[PDB]
Design a binder for this molecule. Sequence first.
Ligand SMILES: O=C1Nc2ccc(Cl)cc2[C@@](C#CC2CC2)(C(F)(F)F)O1
Ligand SMILES: [Ca+2]
Ligand SMILES: [Ca+2]
Lengths: 406, 543
Amino acid sequence: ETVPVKLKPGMDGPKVKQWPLTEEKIKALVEICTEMEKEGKISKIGPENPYNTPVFAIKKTKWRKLVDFRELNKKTQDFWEVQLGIPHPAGLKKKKSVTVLDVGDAYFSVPLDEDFRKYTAFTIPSINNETPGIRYQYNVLPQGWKGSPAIFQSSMTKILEPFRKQNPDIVIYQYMDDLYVGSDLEIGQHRTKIEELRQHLLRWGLTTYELHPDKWTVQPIVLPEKDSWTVNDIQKLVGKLNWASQIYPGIKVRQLCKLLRGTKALTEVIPLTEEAELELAENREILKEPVHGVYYDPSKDLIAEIQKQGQGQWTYQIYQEPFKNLKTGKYARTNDVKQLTEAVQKITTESIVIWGKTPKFKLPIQKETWETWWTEYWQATWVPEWEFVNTPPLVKLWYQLEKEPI
Amino acid sequence: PIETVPVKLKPGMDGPKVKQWPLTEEKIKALVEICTEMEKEGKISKIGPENPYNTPVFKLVDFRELNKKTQDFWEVQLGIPHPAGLKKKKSVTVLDVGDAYFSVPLDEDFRKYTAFTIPSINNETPGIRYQYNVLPQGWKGSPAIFQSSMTKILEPFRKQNPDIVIYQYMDDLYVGSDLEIGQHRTKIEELRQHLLRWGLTTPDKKHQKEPPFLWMGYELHPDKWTVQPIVLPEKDSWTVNDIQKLVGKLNWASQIYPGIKVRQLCKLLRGTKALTEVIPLTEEAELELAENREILKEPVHGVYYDPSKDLIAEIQKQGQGQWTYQIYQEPFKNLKTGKYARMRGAHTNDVKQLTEAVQKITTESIVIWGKTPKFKLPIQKETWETWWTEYWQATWVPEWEFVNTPPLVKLWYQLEKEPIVGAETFYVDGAASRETKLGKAGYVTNKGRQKVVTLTDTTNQKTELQAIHLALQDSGLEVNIVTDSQYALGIIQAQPDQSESELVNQIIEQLIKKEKVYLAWVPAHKGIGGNEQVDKLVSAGIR
DNA sequence: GTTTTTCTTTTGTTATTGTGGCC
RNA sequence: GAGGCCACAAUAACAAAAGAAAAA
Ligand SMILES: O=C1Nc2ccc(Cl)cc2[C@@](C#CC2CC2)(C(F)(F)F)O1
Ligand SMILES: [Ca+2]
Ligand SMILES: [Ca+2]
């Protein structure tokens, strides 16, 4: 049977333009979609259907089809969150090891509301615009729609209810096409409990690491320790601390700027007065202390910002209001675009578990260059929001000082 | 026998209700014979009072209003093929489908909206009314629906004959094979038979056109392509419209003629000015107009794409912010050429600007050929590497190699990462008025020197660059400078070879001349010694 | 004090004019 | 009844986008 879905009144359907694809990805996508037609999943459609959604070919072994339903999900957001949303388990972040595998095929056997299929329309392009472009639409629940979990949800609890009574200190949470299952078991005992669900799910037609949730710890800023200070060394420390005051208002620089009396030579060694050495150590203690006064709001979007910190290394922050970072961190290595895509994907996984939302990314990269190469290394089944920005130099210089774990 | 496409009106709209005006008795006499024929052939049908809609006779009928009211469709042949992505063929054939539109029937329920009226001459008695049974000429949906029919019809024939490429474009089919001309001519007639089963007619062998084929302004031969020759008129006086026409022709040629340039003919068109206003050519424009004239005297041609060889793109800096490129598979046989205008930002660096030219060409190459090229770039491999590892923006060019064709692209200067011992320390700053635009900028040094200048009709930021201009002008070949303007520190650490502002450029030349410069930043209004003395002096006048 | 005005290294839009074409 | 439509370009305009920054 089918769930009667509809869009809000002031909302047309999606009409996104399809980014050019390489010949190799077009050949792969043609193959995949004819096999999905032959199985009744998708249907060829006509020119009278004006809507469209981008299609890509990503790497998740043998080729896989990814549809970028971002614009459509915004257009059915009152449906899959208010009407049939999924609550978030605060407990999930606290397990010792949380693994997640692909529940993709689960959606492929439920019919999609007929009066709604027309929005799922997508187009396989053709090289050099030599053939009109292959247009399909969806007859079943599409991987990558947010409306798909909300519908198979009523059926999802019933698949998982036998395992949830049997093992009731393990948490199960599904975002999009993924099941996040959280355990405190040993590494041998985690790997046995996973085969338990891989055998349990083949009983409803569903084929099929991240030991991290207790390892995501916000590192402190670590100011330089020097036996002699030059007028330079203190001038730059002052500007950084002065900016970091927006984040930590306890930071003070007055006893340091007093030290810089008269136009000195940039190399001249200033001994730190006993007052100035106290300020520097009061500052150090503010930075080792966890930041305070920031609390996650659910009525607000997460934002993720990433700085190209240095060769092979990247700094990031997850925040909702400026300077109030709910997380900060360091990813280290390949090229820039490959690392960024892997960094974007790690942050989104982390951010799901912890809040069950994905953040809107601010990426330091020209848009066109991103559109060209991101599918070359993308592996996930969802696609976050993202925006293209520049990096203030003070922002990288500051977050450079986080302590890297060993 | 072609099944119709269901077509609807835009939500909440009714059909056209436009009044029909009277016409010449000679015009009324001619139309009635045109429609009486169409009615006999079943293209149109007489209608009566039951139909409330109407559209005026002009394409035979002017459907502006119906097109506004008709649903949108999905894009049809959005972009056009570029000849340089066609593969070489030994036999080509073009059939133009003649009764194209008349051969596809119109969705039965939609037909009522296409009604029109031939009025009578006296205009006291109502005239003859009709509506369309087939895709009307100039109806918004007619091109897309015909193409949908044609693609369905061509499917089996494509299935039985894989090695034949059929490209469809408007009313025309372009058919290509590597068969020998006789077997090719057999297949074409097989195609004609298959199309005729559905009522589509095409020219027989005696009436098919012989290559080369004119198409979209190209001239398509079986093994090469070209554009029709481009004549830039030679005139003593040029109007703004004249220069518009030159740039358009020149741009059109950019694809096959290497090294075309337009920037300085473009700079003339900058002033808003009536199309009739005579505009006198600058001499850089008079010069680069000439260089383009010589380029268009040569003959040129492009080859087609050989899917079994690597794509190669080679880029040369052709001048002031301009770039130029060629894409080939064989060393002297280019598939196409092109140019790049760039200058998105005021303060641009060549190294980056090249990377932009590379990103444009990478994208165009995926469109035309379905894969990315290999690059030949006038930039050394570690002049590239030092720039990008010290830049905040990420990028990626997967495969390029150095090619030594001057002018090479190089970073003009690089600023120091540590303070220069024994170089005079300068503290620089400026200040300017919020209302009167009077400002001052100057410096003091740890050696005791100091200087202030006065500036007019300026701003705080412009003055702050002037201050760094002072310190570099009046210091030795090694120098430390300390400023409070992150604005000014950023523009300089961008290494902009080309900038909109004349003043920015002059500093750049001064940084070439110095051979050690260490530039640093300290926050304003924090009483930092050195900063505080110069803040005092340069904020004196107005503050 | 929060709201102003200035610049730019990120993205985008509606209009004209021009080149090559079509219906 | 003041030709639509497509690609490409140039010019003009809104950037009320965004970001950062100065200044009051
Ligand atoms: O792939 C090829 N190669 C080629 C070479 C010469 C000619 Cl003249 C034509 C072609 C052809 C085409 C086309 C569109 C531009 C109309 C065709 F299919 F043969 F029509 O496509
Ligand atoms: Ca100042
Ligand atoms: Ca024209």
